[PDB]
Amino acid sequence: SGVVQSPRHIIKEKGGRSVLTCIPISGHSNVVWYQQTLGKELKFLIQHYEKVERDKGFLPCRFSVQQFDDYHSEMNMSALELEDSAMYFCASSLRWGDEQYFGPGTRLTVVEDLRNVTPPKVSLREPSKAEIANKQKATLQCQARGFFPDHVELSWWVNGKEVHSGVSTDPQAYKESNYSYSLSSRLRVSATFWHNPRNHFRCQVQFHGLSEEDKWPEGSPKPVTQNISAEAWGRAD
Amino acid sequence: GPHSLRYFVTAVSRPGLGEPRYMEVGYVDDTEFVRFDSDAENPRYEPRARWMEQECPEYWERETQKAKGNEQSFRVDLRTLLGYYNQSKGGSHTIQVISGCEVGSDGRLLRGYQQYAYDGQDYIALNEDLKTWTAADMAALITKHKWEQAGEAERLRAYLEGTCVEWLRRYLKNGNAT
């Protein structure tokens, strides 16, 4: 019932190549590819109506797209450069000019060296004893650092349930070094809630790393896609 | 803007006595260099400058196909705006669209524009931010809504920032004396 895009996240070495694919809504005949760079913007790339190109702009000659018999279109991307690291969206209107329906988008990051890909390090620190005594409002800081590239999605899980109320994750990852980023998020909890030793707090960080197809030189574990979390229980004092 | 490339699009409607006279005219800087005209015995994109006379032969087929598509697209709009404004089906009308980009000495886009006009009065236009529309009346609010749900702003922006500048840079190279 919605536009499907795959894959959601890929890490490719500079000069490599990978294909992005997009399944439009059934019956839709107008597909259009948009690219959005890391700096907030939206760039029109290509428009294909009824299996043929209709309008083109900003689409490099290195990229080639084409519709198929089932109207699904794929984007061939070759000779990848670091500047190609961006998010690629796929809208599919029924007819040209009709309301378009976007897809989830594909997060492509082109890296110089695949060895620099490294999973994060997640650790959360309990609220300060000073603040809880004065404000009765505990703040739980979570620190995920040492990862590359910027393919993390942090979420909070209290009592086994994902919660959006009270959390305040940093908007962007802060790059510490050339090949290591760091993200911080803090969840506020009332002192009476945090002081209950029965409440389980968990800050998980989903990391989208190398694919299985991508070869890995041994001597170290492959930085495959994975979510690691640091948990802590409520404390009473 | 030392160098600009514009396009004037006119779709004069005649309800009876035939079909709408449709024609496109372009000006590198302020000199006309290409032209289309529906009311020709065998209409084709024709050059109006010596430097355009030598252009690629496949270029003329690419643009002539595009015009006939725009001709059919504007034939539907003429009918649509009779339904928007609740106008009679037997009155002559005119849609004027001017599209163009002017670039400075540095070769980067100074300002891009696209001004629609129905029967002399401004209808809709693309703002200076190249992302938002500015509609002039209630019906233009309907068209503005369509282009927003359709994503026309991103498509048109990519034309003025990209396609228009590259081909203007290409036209000026042809234009200089061989």
Binding site: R54, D55, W96, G97 | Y7, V9, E24, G26, E63, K66, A67, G69, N70, S73, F74, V76, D77, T80, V97, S99, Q114, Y116, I124, T143, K146, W147, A150, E152, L156, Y159, T163, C164, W167
Partner: peptide
């Protein structure tokens, strides 16, 4: 080149 005008 010229814009590919679509419906309004």
């Amino acid at each position: 080149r010229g814009y590919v005008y679509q419906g309004l």
